[PDB]
Amino acid sequence: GLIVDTRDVEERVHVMRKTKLAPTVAHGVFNPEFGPAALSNKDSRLNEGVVLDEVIFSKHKGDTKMSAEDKALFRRCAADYASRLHSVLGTANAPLSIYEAIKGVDGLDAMEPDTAPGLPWALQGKRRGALIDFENGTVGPEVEAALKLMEKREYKFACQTFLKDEIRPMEKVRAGKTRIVDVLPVEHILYTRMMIGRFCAQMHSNNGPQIGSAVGCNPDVDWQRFGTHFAQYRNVWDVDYSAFDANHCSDAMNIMFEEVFRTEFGFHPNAEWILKTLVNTEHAYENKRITVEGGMPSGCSATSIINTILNNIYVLYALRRHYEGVELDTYTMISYGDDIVVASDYDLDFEALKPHFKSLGQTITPADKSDKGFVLGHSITDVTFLKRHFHMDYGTGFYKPVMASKTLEAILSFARRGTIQEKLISVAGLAVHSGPDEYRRLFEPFQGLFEIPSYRSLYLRWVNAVCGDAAAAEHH
Ligand SMILES: [Mg+2]
Ligand SMILES: [Mg+2]
């Protein structure tokens, strides 16, 4: 987005310095070109002259203003996608109760009891457990009061900037490209869930190419569903954005919120309002208060959904701005936030769509190098989605989500202290699709030190998960 104002204030907002990630026994074996991101300016493995503060906020270069003709086209595309979206999901989008927003419903997980409250509760030394009761699903005196200000549409807030403690490629570690988590006030998260949580639960349950959303999918079981769908198209594209959510211009965001979250689709009028508060935001980093116009904060309860919705509208927009007579059935797509796979039987020229995406402030490049740009004739077994390839399991004839071995090596190389055994069981479920030989090699350093699930047990778990009938018929 656009940094419009930078102010220095009395209160200092401390950020999480020093990593919680420590190397494992696997690190010495795989030696990954990876490591924990820089969390302080004094971290010795940074490049010289790199000021972490200017780099973590360098992603704000934009807020691209759209022309009147482009804005009207964006509205038609947002209306057309919303029309499809609410045709599949339905119009049961009434506000969640305070109780249901905290405890969750079917398709929507419960709110995290101790994960940071936001501002100004962090300055006041209050944790989430003090402001809200999470077992009984009730609210304290201040959250209750903040909800009133939101109903009246006068509520204001600040986003708390957190440095994301995560494994990053060493090249990005040295460059100081630490990602940030924009922590929003817990009451704002509560209210957003109240306003659109019902909608969110319905998208999770109805995930798939029809609504263009993979949010809430289970890759183990769903890769067969997604794989078989995209396999019947002549052309498949793996499209990468550079800084997707940072570059959502305010014009795109505003029109989207207006078209998708209308009262005529069963929404409370404040659904549009609360979402619109994400457009122009104030961010608190140490002593600095940075006002940003445009872009999406990662702290909102529905960031993945919003990004996914925008991703769908963007593709419809860029195709309509280039070709004539483009409709929703001209192509098919699946997205999870910025991650995207597009397919069509038409020989669509994705290379010429570049300046049409640029009009939204977004930069599209092919995932597979700069192969003289975008090319035709690629299939779903050539693309990547959610860091997983589409490979055929020769024993069942089902598509399986296969992660690159280098990524699995990197994931197994670091862990938070005391979580290593739990992490191994989790990663084993990801690594089983790499085959028995590769699965064995990845977990060799942990042998004797931790329980490692047998390849066999995880394969048999997968077969039943993807198709119960197939596992049942196996015992013919
Ligand atoms: Mg939460
Ligand atoms: Mg947190």
Residue numbers in the entry: 1 to 476
What does the paper say about this structure?
Two different crystal forms were obtained; the single mutants 3D(P44S) and 3D(P169S) incubated with sym/sub-U RNA crystallized in the tetragonal P42212 space group. The X-ray structures were determined to 2.2 Å and 2.6 Å resolution for 3D(P44S) and 3D(P169S), respectively, and to 2.6 Å and 2.5 Å for 3D(P44S, M296I) and 3D(SSI), respectively. Thus, substitutions at the conserved amino acid P44 might disturb both the shape and interactions of the template channel, and the interactions with the incoming rNTP that are mediated by residues of motif F. Interestingly, the amino acid residues from M16 to K18, at the N-terminus of the enzyme, appear totally re-organized. The rearrangements in M16-K18 were also observed in the uncomplexed 3D(P44S), but with a weak electron density and higher temperature factors than the average, reflecting some degree of flexibility of this region in the absence of RNA. Thus, the structural results point at P44S as the key substitution related to reorientation of template residues that might be associated with altered RMP recognition and incorporation. 3D(P44S) displayed undetectable incorporation of RMP opposite C in the template (<0.5% of elongated sym/sub-AC), and only a modest incorporation opposite U (5±1% of elongated sym/sub-AU).
Here we describe a new mechanism by which foot-and-mouth disease virus (FMDV) can become resistant to ribavirin. Amino acid changes in the viral polymerase, selected by ribavirin, are able to modify the types of mutations produced in the presence of ribavirin.
